[PDB]
Amino acid sequence: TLQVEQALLKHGSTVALPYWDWTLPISQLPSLFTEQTFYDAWKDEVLE
Amino acid sequence: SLTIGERRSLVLALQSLEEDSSATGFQALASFHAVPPLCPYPEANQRYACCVHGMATFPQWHRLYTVQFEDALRRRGALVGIPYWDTVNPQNSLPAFFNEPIYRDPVLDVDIPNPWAGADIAFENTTVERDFKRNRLSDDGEHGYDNWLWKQFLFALEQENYCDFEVQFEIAHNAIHAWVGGSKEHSMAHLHYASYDPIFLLHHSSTDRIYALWQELQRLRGHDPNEANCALELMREPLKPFSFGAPYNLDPITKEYSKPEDVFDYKSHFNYEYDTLELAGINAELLL
Amino acid sequence: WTIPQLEEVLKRQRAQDRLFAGFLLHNIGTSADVQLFICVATERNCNHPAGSFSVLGGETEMPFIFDRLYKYDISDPVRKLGLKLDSAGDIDLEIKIRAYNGSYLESSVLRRPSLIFVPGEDNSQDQTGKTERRLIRKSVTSLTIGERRSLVLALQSLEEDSSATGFQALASFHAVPPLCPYPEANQRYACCVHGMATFPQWHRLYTVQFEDALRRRGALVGIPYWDTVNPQNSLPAFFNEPIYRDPVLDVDIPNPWAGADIAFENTTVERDFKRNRLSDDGEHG
Amino acid sequence: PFSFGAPYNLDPITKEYSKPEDVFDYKSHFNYEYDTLELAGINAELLL
Amino acid sequence: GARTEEASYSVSGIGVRKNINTLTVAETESLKKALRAVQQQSGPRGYQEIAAAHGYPGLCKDNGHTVACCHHGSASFPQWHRLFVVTLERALTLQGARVGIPYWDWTESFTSLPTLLTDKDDNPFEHGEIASLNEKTTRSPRPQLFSDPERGEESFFYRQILLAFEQRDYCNFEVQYEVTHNAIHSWIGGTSPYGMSTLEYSAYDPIFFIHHSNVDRQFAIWQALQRYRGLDYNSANCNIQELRQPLEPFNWDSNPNDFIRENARAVDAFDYDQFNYQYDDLNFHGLTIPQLEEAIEKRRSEDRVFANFMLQGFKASADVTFDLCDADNHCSFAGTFAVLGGPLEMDWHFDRLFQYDVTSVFNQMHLRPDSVYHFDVHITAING
Amino acid sequence: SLIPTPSVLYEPKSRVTSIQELPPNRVRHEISHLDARATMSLKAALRD
Ligand SMILES: *[C@@H]1O[C@H](CO)[C@@H](O[C@@H]2O[C@H](CO)[C@@H](O)[C@H](O)[C@H]2NC(C)=O)[C@H](O)[C@H]1NC(C)=O
Ligand SMILES: *[C@@H]1O[C@H](CO)[C@@H](O[C@@H]2O[C@H](CO)[C@@H](O)[C@H](O)[C@H]2NC(C)=O)[C@H](O)[C@H]1NC(C)=O
C-alpha cells in the first residue's frame, strides 16, 4: 500500500486514496464507482 | 530570508502543481486568468477575460486570486504563505532562488530542475521565455533609495479619496510587467501569458502587501478601511469567474466570498497576514 | 442673499450626505440633451426619469476633450423613490440621448456613466490621537540602505565618544577593570554571571542598556541579530568590509561594525573565523 | 553593577528594573519585540 | 479694538430628520438645551404661546365659541400640523439649533418608551409646565400599549397603515389615518386627565411634536407611493371648498416667519420643496416603495369583511371598544379604536365613512355572514 | 492621436503646521530639564 501513494503524488495527486468502509449499514456499492463517464468542461470531451 | 525547509516545501508544491491536469492545476489557473476567455457569461457569443483591468475592482480581484492560490498551496502542503518579492529597494543583483534552474534537494541528496525557472503552455506546446534588464535593477537614483517607482508609490500613498488610488496603482502594477517582460510577447509583458509565469505570484503578492499597507495608512488618518463609495455601479456583482460554482470555482471559501464587498476584512477572513506592514526598510508610522 | 450670509447656507448644504452621478463627455457634432432613467429590480423595468442636462455642439465647433468628471445630483429622485440612501447596489442608471430636431442617438457614443456617493461633512476629527512607540528587531539579512546607514552612523558616533556614557565605559562592565561586587571591598573581580540562574537576566539587561541608548543616539530600528542556527556558507559582508560607502554623501567611512579597538589598552583585536565547519550542513540539510 | 546609580551607572530606566525577579515581561517593561519568535524558519507549534 | 463679525443667523437650507437611534451626544444635548431655552424664553419664538394653539386658553372664534380651531377631524388635518411643526423647527433653529426634530416611529415591536423620555436630569421632554394654570403634565402608559391580541406580537398600527395605503383618492385617507393619529395620543395620555388624551394639556409635551413628525412622515410615504402609482400627487379632487381658507392663526400679523405667511394655504402645502425640511430614509421597515405595492397587493388579493362606521363628534374624549356576540351569545373581543375630542373644539364631521378589517374573528369562529350575530359597542371614558 | 493631449496641474502650498518627528538628539531641550547624564555627556563631548 505504501508503494503507491508516493507514486500518485509524483504523478500529481492532491489527495491519497482513502479506505472503503462497511461497518455502517451497507446497501449498494458507493457512487464513486457506479458512474462510467463524465464531462470535463475543459476540452469539450468526456473521460471514463 | 526564506529557509532551506521553506524552499523545499515551496519547490515540492510547485513541482506537484506543474504536473497534474485536473480542474485544480497550473493550466487551470492559466485558463482562469486569461485566454481561453470565458467571461463574464460563458454562453454569450462574445469572449471576454475575467482579468478586470482598468477600474476600481482590480485590487480586489487580484487579492482574491492570490487567496485562491494560497488555499491551493496550503492544501498541497507548505509551512508559510507565498512570499513577496519587493522591488522598491535597488537590488545589486537578481536573487538566484528562481534564477537558478537546478535546485539541490538535500533531504533526498539529489538535484531537481527548478519549476520556478519557468513553465510551458498547454494548448500551444511552446515554452514561455524569461527576459530581464539588469539596468532596471541598477536604477537607483541620486539618493539610491529614490528609485524610479519610489516617488510614484509615495505619490500613491496619500490620496484620501479611494477611486483616485487605482489610477496610478495600475500604472505601478504594469511598470514591473514592462520591466520584466522584455521584447518577446510570450512573456510577462502580455496579458494572454501571465499565469504561465511564476513571478506573477511574487509581484501580485507585493501589490497586495502595498494595498494592505494603505489599509492602515488611511486608518491612521481615521476613515473606513472597507469603503468603496465611488464604485457602487461596479460593485453590485460578484467577481467572475468566482461567481460560478462547479466546475471552475471549486473552492467553497472562494465561492462564499465571491462577493466583492466582504473581501476587505481579509485579516479576519483569510487567516493570512504579512509579517511587516512596511515599505522599503521603513515603516509607515513615520511615512505619514 | 448677499455675500456674508450664504456661506453658512452652503456649509449647511454640504453638511449632509448626497448622492451623485458622474459623466465624461466630449464633442458629439451637434448640441443635444441627455436623459436619465433609474432601472430598478422588480426582472427590471426603466420608465421613471431622474433628471437631465444638455451639451453644446456644432459642425463648426472646435474638437475638444474634457479633463475631469462632471457631477450631477440625483438625490431628490432617488430619495423620492425611497430606496436605500447609501446601499444603492441594485440601482442601475440608463442613458438616452435626445437631439435638438427630436432625433435620438445610441448611448454607445458616450462613455458608460458611473455612480458616486459622498458622505456628509459630519466628521469632526480624523487623525489618531496618539501612536505607540515600540521597537522591532529584524535579522541582519533583511536590511535596507536607509536604516542600515542610520545604524552604522549611530554606532560610529557612539564609538568615538569618550564620555561617561561612552562605548568604552559601557562595555567595561563585563570585565577589566573589575567593579564588582563593589570597589570598596579589598577583593576585586568581574561578575559576568556564568553557570548560575541569572544568566539570561543579566545578559538581557545588558543588551537593553545598549539598545535604548543607541536608539536615542539615532537608530530607527532595534539591533539586528545574526541568527546562527541555519547554515552560513559565507558570512554576511555587513561585518567584513572595513570601509562602508554612504550613498547620500558618497563618502567612505571605517565601518564600526567591521571592527573596533580597545581604549585603555590600545591594542587591535582580530577575528578568528575558523571556516572549517562554521558552515555546517549535516546529513539531512 | 546595575544596582549602583550615578555616577557609576547613568541611565535611570534600568535602576527600577535592577531587580532580577521582574525582568521577564519584556513586552511591557522594555517595549521591544521580535519580528517573530521563529527558530530557523520553524514556529512554536511545529517545533513542539 | 476688534469687531465681532458674527450673527445674521440665517434660517435656510433646513437639514434632515433622523431617527431616535441615529443621534449622538452633541446633537442630542444641543436639541434638549435648545428646547429648554425656547420653552423658558418668551416672544416670537415663544414655545408656550406657539403651543397654545391646541388648548388653553384657545385663540379662535366660531359662532360665539372660543376654541383652539386646529383642525382635528375635518379634511384639512395634515397640513395644519405640518405647518405647526415647520414653525417650531424654524423657531428652534433660529436660536442656533443643529438639525430638525427626530421622529419616533411606533410600527416596530417596541416594548417601552425611547431613550429620550427615560432621561432624568434637565430634559424638557419628561414634563411640561404651563404658567397659565400652574400644574405638571403627567404620562399614563397602559399595559395594552405593548400588547396586541388581534394578530399577535406584531405592532398594532401595521394593519392600520396597510389598510390606509391601498386606496388611490385623497379624502378617503384621513378617515383611516386620523384614528391611528388619535389612538396613540389617547393611550399615552392614559387614565391621567393631565396628559395627551386631552386637548389643553396635549400641546406642552414634546411627545406630541414627535408623534406629529412621524405622522407627517407617513403622509409623505403615502404621497410618494401615490406618485409611483401614477395619480395626482400635489392636490385633491374632492372637497375643494374647505381647502382654500387661511390656515389660522398663521395668517395673522403675529407670524415671525415671512415665508409661510404668503403661502399659508392648503393646495400649496402639499409640496415641501420650499419648506426646506427633508427626511433621511423614508423606508418602511426597510421595505421600500418598490415593495409596498405588492405587499398591499398580496394583502388585498383575498376576501375580507369590514365593519363600517360613521364616526361623529361629541365634544368629549373617550376610548371605544366593540365585542362580537353570535346567536349563542359567545361574546368575544374583535377590535377597538379611539376618537379625538374636547370641550374646547367645534363639532366636526367625517365626509366619508370609516373602515375596519374584522376577517380574523369570522374566519376563526366560522361566523360566515349568513348567520345571525351582533356587536355591542362600549364608549369608555378616560376614567372608566 | 491615440492618446489625448495632456495638461498641467499646479499643487499649491500647504500652510498647515506640522509636528515633525526626529530622534531625541538634534532637539534642543531646555537647560534646567537636563539631567546629570546629559550634563556630563555634553561637557565631555565639548572638552574632547
Ligand atoms: C438631427 O440632427 C442630426 C445632426 O445633424 C442629423 O444627423 C445627421 O443627418 C445627416 C443627414 O440626415 C447625416 O449626413 C449626418 O451624418 C448625421 N449626423 C449625425 C451626427 O447623426 C439628423 O438627421 C437630424 N434629424 C433628422 C430627422 O434628420
Ligand atoms: C369622568 O367621568 C365622567 C362621566 O362620564 C365624565 O363626565 C363627562 O364629561 C363632562 C365632565 O363634566 C360632562 O359633559 C359630563 O359629566 C360627562 N359627559 C359625557 C358625555 O359623558 C368626566 O369627563 C370624566 N373625567 C374626565 C377627566 O374626563
PDB file of N, CA, C and O and ligand atoms in Angstrom, chain E residues 193 381-383, ligand 2:
ATOM      1  N   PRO E 193     -56.021  62.662  33.416  1.00  0.00           N
ATOM      2  CA  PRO E 193     -56.538  63.704  32.517  1.00  0.00           C
ATOM      3  C   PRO E 193     -55.501  64.746  32.146  1.00  0.00           C
ATOM      4  O   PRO E 193     -55.723  65.501  31.192  1.00  0.00           O
ATOM      5  N   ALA E 381     -65.051  56.153  29.056  1.00  0.00           N
ATOM      6  CA  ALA E 381     -64.365  57.405  29.321  1.00  0.00           C
ATOM      7  C   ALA E 381     -62.970  57.135  29.881  1.00  0.00           C
ATOM      8  O   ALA E 381     -62.634  56.017  30.282  1.00  0.00           O
ATOM      9  N   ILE E 382     -62.147  58.187  29.902  1.00  0.00           N
ATOM     10  CA  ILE E 382     -60.778  58.051  30.385  1.00  0.00           C
ATOM     11  C   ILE E 382     -60.732  57.679  31.861  1.00  0.00           C
ATOM     12  O   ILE E 382     -59.681  57.260  32.357  1.00  0.00           O
ATOM     13  N   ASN E 383     -61.846  57.826  32.579  1.00  0.00           N
ATOM     14  CA  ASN E 383     -61.959  57.379  33.961  1.00  0.00           C
ATOM     15  C   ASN E 383     -62.864  56.160  34.104  1.00  0.00           C
ATOM     16  O   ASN E 383     -63.392  55.906  35.191  1.00  0.00           O
TER      17      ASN E 383
HETATM   18  C1  LIG G   2     -65.060  61.241  34.450  1.00  0.00           C
HETATM   19  O1  LIG G   2     -66.256  60.563  34.066  1.00  0.00           O
HETATM   20  C2  LIG G   2     -67.363  61.451  33.839  1.00  0.00           C
HETATM   21  C3  LIG G   2     -68.553  60.584  33.500  1.00  0.00           C
HETATM   22  O2  LIG G   2     -68.596  60.276  32.113  1.00  0.00           O
HETATM   23  C4  LIG G   2     -67.030  62.462  32.739  1.00  0.00           C
HETATM   24  O3  LIG G   2     -68.089  63.410  32.651  1.00  0.00           O
HETATM   25  C5  LIG G   2     -68.392  63.660  31.259  1.00  0.00           C
HETATM   26  O4  LIG G   2     -67.728  64.855  30.740  1.00  0.00           O
HETATM   27  C6  LIG G   2     -68.153  66.143  31.225  1.00  0.00           C
HETATM   28  C7  LIG G   2     -67.494  66.363  32.570  1.00  0.00           C
HETATM   29  O5  LIG G   2     -68.366  67.023  33.478  1.00  0.00           O
HETATM   30  C8  LIG G   2     -69.676  66.296  31.251  1.00  0.00           C
HETATM   31  O6  LIG G   2     -70.135  66.546  29.928  1.00  0.00           O
HETATM   32  C9  LIG G   2     -70.379  65.068  31.813  1.00  0.00           C
HETATM   33  O7  LIG G   2     -70.156  64.955  33.214  1.00  0.00           O
HETATM   34  C10 LIG G   2     -69.901  63.805  31.117  1.00  0.00           C
HETATM   35  N1  LIG G   2     -70.292  63.817  29.717  1.00  0.00           N
HETATM   36  C11 LIG G   2     -70.458  62.704  28.997  1.00  0.00           C
HETATM   37  C12 LIG G   2     -70.867  62.901  27.569  1.00  0.00           C
HETATM   38  O8  LIG G   2     -70.289  61.588  29.478  1.00  0.00           O
HETATM   39  C13 LIG G   2     -65.718  63.179  33.035  1.00  0.00           C
HETATM   40  O9  LIG G   2     -65.335  63.984  31.926  1.00  0.00           O
HETATM   41  C14 LIG G   2     -64.619  62.169  33.330  1.00  0.00           C
HETATM   42  N2  LIG G   2     -63.376  62.843  33.665  1.00  0.00           N
HETATM   43  C15 LIG G   2     -62.517  63.284  32.741  1.00  0.00           C
HETATM   44  C16 LIG G   2     -61.284  63.956  33.259  1.00  0.00           C
HETATM   45  O10 LIG G   2     -62.729  63.150  31.541  1.00  0.00           O
END
